[PDB]
Amino acid sequence: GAAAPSESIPSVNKAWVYSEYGKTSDVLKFDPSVAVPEIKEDQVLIKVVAASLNPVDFKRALGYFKDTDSPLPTIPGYDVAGVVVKVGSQVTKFKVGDEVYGDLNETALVNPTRFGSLAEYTAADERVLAHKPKNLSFIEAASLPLAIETAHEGLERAELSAGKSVLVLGGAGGVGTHIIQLAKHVFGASKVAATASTKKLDLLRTLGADLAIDYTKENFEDLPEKFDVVYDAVGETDKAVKAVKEGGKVVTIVGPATPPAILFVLTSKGSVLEKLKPYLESGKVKPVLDPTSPYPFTKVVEAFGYLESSRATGKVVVYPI
């Protein structure tokens, strides 16, 4: 990884952009000539290969955290996978040519970058990145970071550990599919239960759920079984706190949290991806892609529309970029 010739890195590129808050179907526009971000000293520039969408992208675009957002206009997209093309003077972990992936924004809700991953090139902090596992495609790798890190962090916050039981509310989405796999294969849960609708129960079982609960037919909180950990990924903490054992832990990623449940917002860290590398290399934890993935870079508006339906199974990914 010698530096790229400087004239080989463009100063403008194609990206999706919005200049005012609103629905993606109204505000999200293709711009054939936006600035490539200049990197800071602790960042790398990446040639984006694939990007995933997350609900935060559209909630952000609606203006839900405008008071702590970065200035408009915005190029959306948190998740990235691609190839390093430039490294800042303080970077030590990556060199030009490294294949990398991560969630760009250390703090999702406070000063996320203006220059997101739905662009041909993007700038990323060294600290949010990890080396792409050789056995994963760029589509697969881009699908992972925000969701798998949120799954991981919520399970750690809930103190999950070997032999304990866990109930996952929303097992079939970007986050939930990882909550199940991590709980079973990384945290050593003795029993993993999870909720989804009728046609998604077999998927939950395939990912490691011992008990798949159809929420459209029955109410988990009325079951006599109670769990050491309940991880709410839907926003049902009122009910979640009824399913936990005394002294157990309930976490949510959708607020507000009814005590004793806690809400948190993930911190994006490349070190989490690195910790999980061996599970990703062995296939014990797999990426989960929605059957409609990938969407071409021309179809980003459609990709958001599908995500906004709340029906995605695993991840919506954009490729080729």
Ligand X SMILES: NC(=O)c1ccc[n+]([C@@H]2O[C@H](COP(=O)([O-])OP(=O)(O)OC[C@H]3O[C@@H](n4cnc5c(N)ncnc54)[C@H](OP(=O)(O)O)[C@@H]3O)[C@@H](O)[C@H]2O)c1
311 is in an annotated binding site: yes
Sole window of 48-56, 85-93, 161-169, 242-250 interacting with ligand 3XX (rule: CB under 6 A): 48-56
Backbone angles phi, psi at 32, to 5 degrees: -75, -10
Between 96 and 254, whose beta carbon lies closer to ligand 3XX?
254
Q: Which residue is nearest to ligand 3XX (CB)?
A: 56
Site for ligand 3XX in 71-130 (CB under 6 A): 108-109
Alpha-carbon distance of 132 to 97, in angstroms, equals 12
Find which of ligand X, ligand 3XX, none residue 215 binds, CB within 5 to 8 Å per kind.
ligand X
311, interface contact from ligand X, ligand 3XX, none, CB < 5-8 Å by kind: ligand X
Q: Tell me whether residue 13 or residue 122 sits nearer to ligand 3XX (CB atom).
A: 122
Contacts of 93 (CB under 8 A, 6+ apart): 126, 129, 270
Closest CA to 316 of 294, 297, 284: 294
Smallest distance, Å, CB 13 to ligand X?
Answer: 27
147 in contact with ligand X (CB under 6 A): yes
> 184 among the known binding-site residues?
no
Question: Cα angle vertex 310, ends 308, 314, to 5°?
Answer: 105
User: Can you tell me which of 143, 150, 258, 268 binds ligand X, judged by CB under 6 A?
Assistant: 150
What does the alpha-carbon distance between residue 20 and residue 73 come to, in Å, rounded to a whole number?
A: 7
Q: Which is nearer to ligand 3XX, 185 or 269 (CB)?
A: 269
Which residues, at least 6 apart from 222, have a Cβ–Cβ distance to it below 8 Å? Answer: none
198 labeled part of a ligand binding site: yes
Applying CB under 6 A, the span of 5-13, 53-61, 126-134, 161-169 interacting with ligand 3XX comes to 53-61
Q: Cβ 60 to ligand 3XX, closest distance in Å?
A: 9
Question: How many CB atoms within 10 Å of residue 109?
Answer: 15
CA gyration radius, the chain? 19
Which of 167, 204, 266, 318: binder of ligand X (CB under 6 A)? Answer: 266
Residue by residue, DSSP assigns 236-250 as -HHHHTTSEEEEEEE
Instruction: Provide DSSP, 208-235.
Output: T-SEEEETTT--GGGSS--EEEEEESSS
Residue 62 as a binder of ligand X (CB under 6 A): the answer is no
Q: Which residues bind ligand X (CB under 6 A)?
A: 54-56, 59, 146-147, 150, 169-170, 172-176, 195-197, 200, 215, 233-234, 253-254, 265-266, 307, 310-313
Residues annotated in a binding site for substrate:
59
